[PDB]
Structures are given as structure tokens and as C-alpha cells.
Design a protein around this ligand. Structure first.
Ligand SMILES: [Ca+2]
Ligand SMILES: [Ca+2]
Lengths: 318, 318
């Protein structure tokens, strides 16, 4: 102990929460941060990630910029700001600096660091799986060299958040998602089916704002825009803790129950970005597209009280 | 009372069970039977349907042959016999018969009978929706003229039976299924999510065989092959009552709880034949492929004890 962690992020209010919680968790050693599109454009994500690490004081942590488009060159310029704001940090508009990313490309850096520490690195994917899929396509030995891949993505036997069928991160790059779910690495999938159970009320956010914590006060300011979205889209006085709940699985995986089986992603619409899990011990009078696919651990149940309490005692502590 | 019923079937051991139960239910008046592919080839389905009505004594009931291929001419010759047998009636090989179908094509007959009795006819679709979709494509006023369409098909937030994503009847013709779920008729969907709750153990089958009922004894003989399939595919000493549970909804719909919303079908693989339901409910910031789609009633919960008891007291009665 502690475990080495690389975080594939698109900051992102919920991403910032997860980044800060990882930096406040002694059981994790944040070795690096890799940026990707999603909530914000890849250059915006880099700017925000560099800024968050400056605020955290952990300036030692390198920031490696990744894919600006999808794996198959689908342009990711011009993206929705109704969830995370124009700046991507809930319209707080921080006074960002001149600090620059580590010039090495994120998939190239991912392969580099995993060969350096085989079976030690735990990649927490908090955005589209493009950077990870590129690393898999580049080096075929990458999948067996990674310690574990904790993915925030998918809607397992539940409706999606982008459209009724798909979840954001998977809808971002369905080709890249299918590559990862089939790559054969130690994979832990945290879908919206379980993140929708982990939420913080207006009072929980208020408690974080009132707290004498540098991070708690910061996150409360960014939360305002994210809270107004949930209030108009889901009509709830609470925010779903997507990315920070995924970070909890890296800290303590005992707080979740997992089901082992194969996961496949539909790449073409209407159901583009749909994640389908096969935990059906019916296996299978004629082979299916889930037959002979490496199994992955998919989170089924959460200890919502213990997850939300840990993501508070850490973010409220001075 | 009673309600006029047309049954779109592919007999089929479970289909035979539903046919017999409908013929033993005084609240339903089986006006006609329309054949389709699925478990068996369309000509085989016709032969079996004519035979079942002969055995039931109800020779007055016309049999109208339908589509031999999918709606878009996808050939349905050469189909799996591991579930219903070579004959389609659990390898019992009955002593059929020179009786012939009513020369009118099933979609043509469906439009004819619905114009004859508008808002009276209840179509119970126990096979692929090809015959019904052709009727919708032919006459646009058909959807509003039908009394109700009770569909056995789909896997709503659960794994499929053909492959982990799709259910048999919907996988048979995904184009036809999407036409029906969008047609705007009074639709009641009974998916495998609820039929997997309604099952009969080996003892239940034994009770049906021991019974002094013509139908019960017949169904027990055909059940042997269907039972051996469930024992090797699902590894259970029970058979899922798919088609007969759908017939129960026609008899007494109170035994099921329904959710109103839009249903769309994925036509191209990996998730070909997937049925996706949108709770409606749901506020969507940007229109989706479920927005502006006519809502349908989807069965959520069953009274498994009362469904299996009714499908026994009727099939055991002499
Ligand atoms: Ca994210
Ligand atoms: Ca059937």
C-alpha cells in the first residue's frame, strides 16, 4: 500500500469531486492525470485538470493530454454546456495559469507507465474510453499489464442519461467502449444503475460549503450550476455523484457487490452506446456475440449511506 | 361479453397451451387463428394450428396463413428445432389431416375482420409481428380500428432468450416490431421479464398429465421435449409459460401491473431485436427517438400464483 492510480478525466464538476477525493484518500497514490473530451473539449479538460492540481497543491502530478476526437476521428468540437457550464467547472471561471501538459500523448503515456509498473497501475476512467482503447489497439499486451480498470459508464438494465438507451461516457465513443469491454483486462464497471443510488441533497452540499475545507468550499461553488441542471432535468433537490462514487470503488471496493460476465456495446443507433451485460447462466444453444468474450466485474448493489458518508468526511476534513 | 379474439401464432408447444386455454375460457370468443413463422415454418404452423382446432373440436374456427418470410423478405426457411421439435409439437408427430387454411392471406384477413368489427377484435400476437405490421403498412386506419393488441415479446430491462439482448418474437422481425410499437394502437406488451416469473414445475406438468382432461393430457405429451430444453439451457426442473401467460392478460388483465410509455426496437446487431421502453415520465433536453412516439402499456409485475393457478384449473377441468 498505497495503490498507484492514473485518472482518465473530462473535468467536469463531478470529475473535480473525484479528483479531490482521490487526493484526500491515503490508500491511493495519484501518479498522473490523463485528459479526454466529454463534459468539455480535450484542451478545456487539460486546462481544468492542471488548475485543479494547482489548487490541490499537488503540482508534482503530470497532466497528459489525450484524444480531441473519437477513436475513429469523429469530431468532438462544439459540445453541450447545460450540465457543467461554459468553463466546465460550473461557470465559476477560475483564474487559470500558464502551466502546460507533459507533451507526451495520453495513450502513449498510459502504455509507458504500465510497462514501468506492471500489475500496479489502476486506471480510473471517468470519461469516454478513447484514450484507453487507443492504448489497447497500439500495444496488445497493455490489457494484461494493467492492474485494474475502473470504468464509470453504461446503464445496465436501466434507462440511459444521454438518451433512454445510452450513458454519456459510452455514447461518447461506443467503438472505444466495446474495445475495452472485450480487451480482457481486470475491469470494474460502475454504471448509472448504481450511481443514481449515490446522491447528495441540497443540505449535503450546504454542509460541504459550511465546512472549513479548501476542497469542500471549492466544490460547493462549482456545484450550484450542476444542482440547477438536476432540478430541471430530473426535478430533484439532489445531485448524482457519478465520478466520485467510481473513485470510492478504487478506495474501498467492499462497498459494492459485483456480477461477473461479458459486456458488449451497440455502436449504431437507435440504441447507439447501449451497454449489454450477460449474467445469464443460460449459456447458450448456438454461440452469441457475448460467447467467448472475457468476463468483467459489473457493480450491482451499493451501500449508498457509506459511499456518501466517505465522500464527505474526506471532503469536509480540514 | 365475450370479447372477440384473433390469435397470431407459431405452434409451438407454449402456443398450443395458449390456444387451448383460450378455447377453455368463456370470456373469450376465438373468432379466427392466423399463422406465422418463428418456432416452426409458416406452412408447419398452419398444419399444427388446423390440427389443434380439430383436437379441440372447434373446427368452425378459420385458419388464415400469413408471411413465410420477414416483412422485408428475409427468408425464414431452415429454423431451430431444439426448443419445439422437428414437428413443432414436441416431437409427438400427430396424425394430421387434409383440412386446409381459409385461402385469404393473414394481413388481408386481419384488415377484413377489423373493419367488420371495429374496436371489438383483440389480436393476441404469440409470434413475430410480421402479419400485423403488413396490415398496418397496407391500411393506415387498421391501428385505430383494432380493439387491443396483446403482444408476447421483448425483454424489458432484462436479458433476452435468443441472445443476451433479444427475445425470440421480436428478433424474428425487428422491422415489423418497431412498426407495431409505433403504430399507435391499444397495445399491451408482455415481455420475458414477466413470463420468466410464470413457470410450471415437473410436478405441475405431472398433475396436468394425471388429470382427466383431453387438453391437459395432450399438452403433457408435447411438454416432454420443451422440459428437456429448459433443463439443459436454463438448468431448471420447470418450463416458462410464455404464450399462455399472455393469454391470461386477455382473460383477466388485473393479474398484471402496467407502465405507460414509448417502445423502440433496434433493427441492426449486436443488439438486433432489443426492445427499449421509455417510462414517459422523462423530460428530455433535446428530442430522442422515443419522443413523439405513441405510448403503449408494458407489463411490469405479475401475480405468478394466480396466473399459474388459472392456467391449470382450466387445463385440468374435464
Ligand atoms: Ca466525467
Ligand atoms: Ca410463440
Amino acid at each position: 500500500p498505497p495503490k498507484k492510480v492514473i485518472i482518465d478525466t473530462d473535468p467536469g464538476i463531478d470529475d473535480a469531486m473525484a479528483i479531490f477525493f482521490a487526493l484526500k484518500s491515503p490508500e491511493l497514490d495519484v501518479i498522473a492525470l490523463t485528459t479526454i473530451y466529454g463534459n468539455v473539449r480535450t484542451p478545456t479538460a487539460t486546462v481544468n485538470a492542471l488548475h485543479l492540481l494547482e489548487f490541490a497543491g499537488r503540482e508534482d502530478i503530470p497532466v497528459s493530454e489525450g484524444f480531441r476526437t473519437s477513436l475513429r476521428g469523429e469530431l468532438k468540437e462544439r459540445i453541450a454546456d447545460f450540465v457543467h457550464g461554459a468553463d466546465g467547472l460550473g461557470n465559476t471561471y477560475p483564474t487559470l495559469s500558464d502551466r502546460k501538459p507533459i507533451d507526451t500523448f495520453a495513450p502513449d503515456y498510459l502504455i509507458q507507465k504500465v510497462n514501468e509498473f506492471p500489475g500496479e497501475i489502476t486506471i480510473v476512467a471517468l470519461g469516454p474510453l478513447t484514450n484507453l482503447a487507443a492504448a489497447v489497439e497500439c500495444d496488445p499486451t497493455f490489457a494484461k499489464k494493467v492492474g485494474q480498470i475502473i470504468i464509470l459508464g453504461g446503464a445496465f438494465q436501466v434507462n440511459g442519461n444521454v438518451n433512454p438507451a445510452a450513458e454519456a461516457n459510452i455514447y461518447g465513443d461506443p467503438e472505444a467502449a466495446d474495445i475495452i469491454f472485450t480487451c480482457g483486462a481486470d475491469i470494474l464497471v460502475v454504471g448509472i444503475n448504481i450511481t443514481h443510488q449515490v446522491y447528495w441533497t441540497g443540505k449535503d452540499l450546504e454542509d460541504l460549503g459550511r465546512s472549513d475545507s479548501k476542497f469542500g468550499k471549492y466544490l460547493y461553488a462549482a456545484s450550484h450550476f450542476y444542482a440547477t441542471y438536476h432540478r430541471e432535468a430530473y426535478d430533484i433537490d439532489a445531485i448524482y455523484l457519478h465520478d466520485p462514487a467510481t473513485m470510492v470503488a478504487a478506495v474501498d471496493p467492499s462497498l459494492m457487490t459485483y456480477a461477473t460476465g461479458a459486456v458488449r456495446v451497440q455502436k449504431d443507433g437507435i440504441c447507439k452506446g447501449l451497454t449489454l451485460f450477460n449474467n445469464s447462466n443460460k449459456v447458450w444453444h448456438d454461440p452469441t456475440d457475448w460467447c467467448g468474450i472475457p468476463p468483467v466485474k459489473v457493480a450491482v448493489t451499493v451501500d449508498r449511506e457509506r459511499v456518501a458518508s466517505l465522500l464527505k468526511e474526506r471532503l469536509t476534513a480540514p
